[PDB]
């Protein structure tokens, strides 16, 4: 179902593509996984610690 | 640690047939001069002199 | 955490802190009115607020939502933000469960929360004499006396820095008084949103307490 | 710290020798070539030994 | 060498064509142009706003719907283009019900508002609204604490970026009296502020003045 | 008052002056080491990965 | 913010360490990244690519009359630097009956170093060789050898944090250049900067 949802849009089938570096501008040797993950900020701040 | 030894294992192995193999190099400086312009692969069965 | 409509109907009036709903003739004479909570202090010094989402002239049903609270969406739970993820070792920065960021996470106002810190200052009576909140404070320059009012309380919505004076208070020792003013903790800056004064019965109120009382009776007469 | 391992066999004797040398540069002594790095360089240069430290200590006790 | 052309697929996103370049120039040239275009390009943004009937950024203003500080957050998305100026004061005025758009403000002769159909807030009661704001320019990105007495003036972070994303990819050209030439295109998506060719010109001028430390 | 000469004095006063670092749960004798600190930004102590 | 430079530290005879004053956050990395490519893919030079040994006719494994075999001669000969004039190509020969300074000199082709040797004589045996120098721009792979037309041997760059009295943190760029003696390191830096400015001046 996730492969069908990936193929329904203009996305690759395997879910992983290649991307160029930002420091030099050249390409990579192995394709990486790019996506959107939901994150959350914890209450363990740095102002109350140091 | 977990980040250094992975790159050192990816760097220090070999495969069957890659581009830029079979040629003879002079020293380590010739390897560093021929690697950065992408005329040879990262791993190839070559004969160098050290 | 979110307000729910007890009886569906037509939204007559709406505001940033008040929702007026008209009860229809099916589930009916007195219409209901809701008061959304504004930026107050929670138990863990976290700012909470409720913002509405409906518009005027809408027809709602019984059990629907009207205002989303802190970390709340249109009817689903929403804790944080969605960002791009690339699993790759980037120059040894992601060494052991380490996370690299970008400039566009910071500059787009993504993970900047609001913390509310409470500070108190009491004034009791010792064996010498009672302490006052007067403005004639010795050894205080004009760089900190400009934020203080005539009553000794800093103005609402005034920007305060770390180490400034907000509540002026003197203690008599024996003309010659000792400075016991409430100081700001270091590294913390921000505006003063609410000022609450708790006075004792039998004591005459000052100008700030009278201003708070007249604003309170004007607001309660308005609602 | 690596050059001083060959001139002396005991590390604690090296620490006590550099501590006896550090009490002189604080009161004012012209160096050979932070007082810690200078004292370690004077030790590793094979110039400061246990006899010269005693000589400067006797001169300081006589010129006190 | 030849001067660059430009194709206009969309009025907000253009692309330049640079040809021809020798072997070893196209990748580093596109990388340096992307780095200069995404590092520091001067533009305009919003600054501290002086609001009439609102004390600080946490009150409850009558008539305005559902927020106070999120109006200041959504006001950062406007585009400001000025001609020979670095400081200008604008003020808007609207009364009655209806939405408040970016094109409903009172602008100057040189100050022009791009994509003024963006929503700002919503007015549900018959009330007035006068927000006097300032426009400053600079380079890079400066927060609110690094830049800075009136309690009626509120600070706001200035994050100006006339371009959003810059991408490039090389390809093979076709010249008869050679074997291969590096042809490349550069995708430039601007936020309605400056043209892509003028952005390329300013980036090339910045890199040319930065490369003058050796010669 | 945080003038600019205070940071110059602070950068000059600790050049080869070592400090001590110690994790609070310690097991063996290598839990307390010494480093020559440098002045960086932020509110977090930077440490070598090895 | 234009910095002051370049501060050059020449510790060896053909190695320099160019230190640049700190710049804004972002330029100090792309400057070195562009320089490390334009110093190799743009700088022209001269190198020997065709070697004709009269001893070894076809194979490069069977050899006699010397100390080592012909592949060691090729590996020692493919590293010498040659600075030439405006002539395009020329054919060079030698006859010794061996030091690189003992080659037949010419008014058009000169060799920078004279200390680097390539062979050793064995039983006073006469040996000859035929060389060819071609003007190129980069690194060309394969009697057939490799010719490194770049005048620099190896480049390196690093971004170090430089503390100033008013900003938080800036980028100090250092450049490691090990030239082959045919060109100064500062002259090569100025030539690469002028070539990059001429390439950026098309707009």
Q: Which residues of F touch B1 (CB under 8 A)?
A: 49-50
Angstrom distance (rounded) from CA E214 to CA G129:
43
Angstrom distance (rounded) from CA E134 to CA E139:
17
Sign, Cα dihedral of E191, E196, E199, E203? positive
- Angle at E67 (CA atoms; ends E62, E68), nearest 5 degrees: 75
CA of C96 vs chain A CAs: smallest distance (Å): 18
Residues G39 and G52 in one domain: no
Total number of domains constituting chain G:
2
C216 token code pair: 């309170």
Contact D37 F16 (CB under 8 A): yes
D15 token code pair: 């620490």
The beta-carbon contacts of B24-27 under 8 Å, at least 24 apart in sequence, are B24/B48, B24/B49, B24/G71, B24/G74, B24/G75, B25/B49, B26/G75, B26/G78, B26/G79, B27/G79
Contact indicator for E93, E105 with CB cutoff of 8 Å: no
Angstrom distance (rounded) from CA G135 to CA B33:
18
Residue E142: name the closest of E37, E35, E50, E42 by CA: E42
Q: Which of G111, G131, G149 is the last residue of a domain?
A: G149
Technique used to solve these coordinates? cryo-EM
According to DSSP, the residues that pair with G139 across neighbouring strands are: G148
Angstrom distance (rounded) from CA C3 to CA C5:
7
In CATH, what class is D1-64? alpha beta
Q: Burial level of E49, CB count in 10 A (0-12/13-18/19+)?
A: buried
Residues E14 and E117 in one domain: no
Residue position matching structure tokens 């000469």: F5
Nearest CA in chain C to B6: C89
Contact E40 G26 (CB under 8 A): yes
G46 token code pair: 């001269």
CA of A12 vs chain E CAs: smallest distance (Å): 19
Contact E56 C193 (CB under 8 A): yes
- Inform me whether the C-beta atom of residue F43 falls under 8 Å from chain A C-beta atoms: yes
Length of chain E as a residue count? 215
Residues G168 and G189 in one domain: yes
In this structure, what are the phi and psi dihedrals at residue E210, rounded to the nearest 5 degrees?
Answer: -80, -25
- Note the Cα E76 to chain centre separation in Å: 10
Residues E155 and E174 in one domain: no
Contact indicator for E147, E64 with CB cutoff of 8 Å: no
Q: How many CB atoms lie within 10 A of CB C41?
A: 15
Residues G32 and G55 in one domain: no
D4 token code pair: 């001083």
Residues G52 and G116 in one domain: yes
Contact indicator for E213, G2 with CB cutoff of 8 Å: yes
CA of F26 vs chain G CAs: smallest distance (Å): 33
Identify the helix (H) or strand (E) that includes residue G152. Answer: strand G152-162
3-state secondary structure D16-39: HHHHHHHHHHCCCCCCCCCHHHHH
Contact E66 C108 (CB under 8 A): no
- Angle at B29 (CA atoms; ends B26, B35), nearest 5 degrees: 100
Residues E148 and E174 in one domain: no
Angstrom distance (rounded) from CA E99 to CA G31:
49
Sign, Cα dihedral of G81, G87, G89, G95? negative
Residue spans of beta strands (DSSP E) within C15-117: 18-23, 33-35, 40-41, 47-48, 51-52, 67-68, 82-86
Residues G133 and G70 in one domain: yes
Contact F44 A47 (CB under 8 A): no
Supply the CATH number for residue E25's domain: 3.30.1360.10
Angstrom distance (rounded) from CA C157 to CA C195:
10
Angstrom distance (rounded) from CA C160 to CA C146:
11
- Inform me whether the C-beta atom of residue B18 falls under 8 Å from chain G C-beta atoms: no
Count CA atoms within 13 Å of residue C189 on its CB side.
9
C in contact with A (at least 3 C-beta pairs within 8 A): yes
- Inform me whether the C-beta atom of residue C198 falls under 8 Å from chain F C-beta atoms: no
CA of B6 vs chain F CAs: smallest distance (Å): 15
Q: Which domain holds residue G155?
A: 1-44+150-203
3-state secondary structure G31-93: HHHHHHHHHHHCCCEEEEEEEEECCCCCCCCCCCCCCCCHHHHHHHHCCCCEEECCCCCEEEE
Residues E108 and E10 in one domain: no
Instruction: Give alpha helix (H) positions in C1-51.
Output: none
Residue C190 makes CB contacts below 8 A (sequence gap 6+) with C159, C160
Q: How many CB atoms lie within 10 A of CB D49?
A: 13
Quoted resolution (Å): 4.0
Residues G102 and G8 in one domain: no
Contact G29 A25 (CB under 8 A): no
C221 token code pair: 């007469």
Residues E198 and E165 in one domain: yes
Residue A9 makes CB contacts below 8 A (sequence gap 6+) with none
- Note the Cα C219 to chain centre separation in Å: 18
Instruction: Give alpha helix (H) positions in chain C.
Output: 103-106, 142-145, 207-222
Residue C143: DSSP 8-state: H
Residue E212: DSSP 8-state: G
Angstrom distance (rounded) from CA C193 to CA C114:
12
> Which chains share 3+ C-beta pairs under 8 angstroms with F?
A, B, C, D, G
Q: Which of E114, E133, E160 is the last residue of a domain?
A: E160
b/e string for A7-38 if b means 16 or more Cβ within 10 A?
eeeeeeeeeeeeebeeebbeeeeeeeebeeee
Length of chain D as a residue count? 64
Q: Where are the domains of chain D?
A: 1-64
| DSSP letter string, E34-96 | HHHHHH---EEEEEEEEESS--STTS--SSB-S-SHHHHHHGGG-EEE-SS-SEEEEEE---S
- Cis previous bond, E20, omega within 30: yes
- Inform me whether the C-beta atom of residue B5 falls under 8 Å from chain F C-beta atoms: no
According to DSSP, the residues that pair with C177 across neighbouring strands are: C172
Contact indicator for B42, B32 with CB cutoff of 8 Å: no
Contact indicator for G102, G94 with CB cutoff of 8 Å: yes
Contact indicator for E71, E58 with CB cutoff of 8 Å: no
Helix, strand, or coil here: C203? coil
Residues G120 and G57 in one domain: yes
Residue G25 makes CB contacts below 8 A (sequence gap 6+) with G169, G170, G171
Supply the CATH number for residue G54's domain: 2.170.120.12
Q: Which of G106, G125, G149 is the last residue of a domain?
A: G149
Cα dihedral value G161, G162, G163, G168, nearest 10: -60
- Inform me whether the C-beta atom of residue B37 falls under 8 Å from chain G C-beta atoms: yes
- Note the Cα G97 to chain centre separation in Å: 30
Give chain E's end-to-end CA distance (angstroms, integer).
22
């Amino acid at each position: 179902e996730i492969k069908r949802m990936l193929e329904l849009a203009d996305l690759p089938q395997s879910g992983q593509t290649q991307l160029y570096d930002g420091r030099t501008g050249e390409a990579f040797d192995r394709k990486t996984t790019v996506g959107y993950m939901h994150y959350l900020k914890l209450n363990h701040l740095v102002d109350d610690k140091m | 640690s977990q980040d250094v030894v992975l790159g050192l294992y990816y760097m220090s192995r070999a495969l069957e047939n890659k581009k830029g193999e079979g040629m003879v190099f002079a020293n380590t400086s010739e390897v560093k001069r021929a690697y950065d312009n992408r005329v040879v692969e990262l791993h190839a069965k070559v004969k160098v002199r050290i | 955490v979110t307000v729910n409509a007890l009886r569906g109907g037509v939204i007559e009036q709406i505001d940033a802190a008040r929702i007026v709903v008209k009860v229809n003739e099916a589930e009916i004479a007195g219409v209901d009115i809701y008061n959304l909570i504004k930026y107050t202090r929670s138990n863990q010094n976290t700012c909470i607020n409720q913002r509405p989402l409906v518009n005027v002239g809408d027809v709602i049903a019984r059990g629907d939502v009207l205002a989303d609270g802190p970390s709340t969406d249109i009817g689903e739970l929403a804790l944080g933000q969605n960002m791009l993820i690339a699993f790759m070792p980037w120059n040894g920065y992601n060494f052991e469960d380490s996370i690299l960021l970008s400039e566009r996470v910071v500059e787009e106002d993504r993970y900047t929360t609001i913390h509310i810190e409470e500070l108190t200052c009491v004034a009791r009576d010792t064996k010498l004499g009672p302490e006052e909140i007067s403005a004639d404070i010795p050894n205080v320059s004009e760089q900190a006396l400009n934020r203080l009012d005539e009553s000794g309380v800093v103005y609402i919505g005034a920007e305060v820095r770390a180490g400034d004076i907000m509540v002026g208070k003197v203690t008599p020792k024996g003309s010659d008084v000792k400075d016991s003013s409430l100081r700001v903790p270091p590294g913390m800056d921000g505006t003063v949103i609410d000022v609450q004064v708790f006075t004792r019965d039998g004591i005459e109120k000052d100008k700030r307490a009278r201003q708070i009382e007249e604003n309170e009776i004007k607001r309660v007469k308005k609602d | 710290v690596e050059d001083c391992l060959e001139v002396v066999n005991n590390r604690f004797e090296l620490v006590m020798m550099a501590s006896k040398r550090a009490r002189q540069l604080a009161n004012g002594v012209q160096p050979l070539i932070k007082p810690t790095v200078m004292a370690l360089r004077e030790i590793a240069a094979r110039r400061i030994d246990n006899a010269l430290i005693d000589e400067v200590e006797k001169a300081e006790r006589e010129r006190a | 060498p030849r001067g660059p052309q430009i194709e206009r697929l969309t009025d907000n996103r253009a692309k330049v064509v640079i040809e021809p370049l020798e072997r070893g120039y196209g990748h580093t040239l596109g990388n340096a142009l992307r780095r200069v275009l995404l590092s520091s390009i001067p533009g305009f943004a919003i600054t501290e706003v002086e609001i009439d009937g609102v004390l600080h950024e946490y009150t409850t203003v009558e008539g305005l719907q559902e927020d106070v500080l999120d109006v200041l957050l959504n006001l950062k998305d406007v585009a400001i283009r000025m001609h020979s100026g670095d400081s200008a004061t604008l003020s808007l005025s609207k009364q009655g019900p209806g939405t408040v758009t970016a094109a409903d403000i009172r602008t100057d002769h040189n100050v022009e508002i791009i994509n003024g159909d963006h929503v700002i807030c919503h007015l549900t009661k018959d009330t007035a609204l006068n927000m006097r704001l300032k426009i400053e320019r600079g380079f890079g990105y400066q927060p609110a604490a690094a830049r800075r007495r009136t309690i009626g003036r509120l600070m706001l972070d200035a994050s100006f970026s006339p371009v959003r994303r810059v991408a490039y990819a090389v390809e093979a050209a076709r010249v008869e009296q050679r074997t291969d030439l590096d042809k490349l295109v550069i995708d430039i998506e601007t936020n309605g502020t400056i043209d892509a060719e003028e952005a390329v010109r300013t980036a090339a001028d910045i890199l040319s003045d930065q490369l003058s430390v050796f010669g | 008052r945080e003038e600019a000469e205070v940071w110059d004095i602070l950068e000059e006063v600790i050049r080869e002056h070592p400090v001590l670092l110690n994790r609070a749960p310690t097991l063996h004798r290598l839990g307390i080491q010494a480093f020559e600190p440098v002045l960086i930004e932020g509110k977090a102590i930077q440490l070598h990965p090895l």
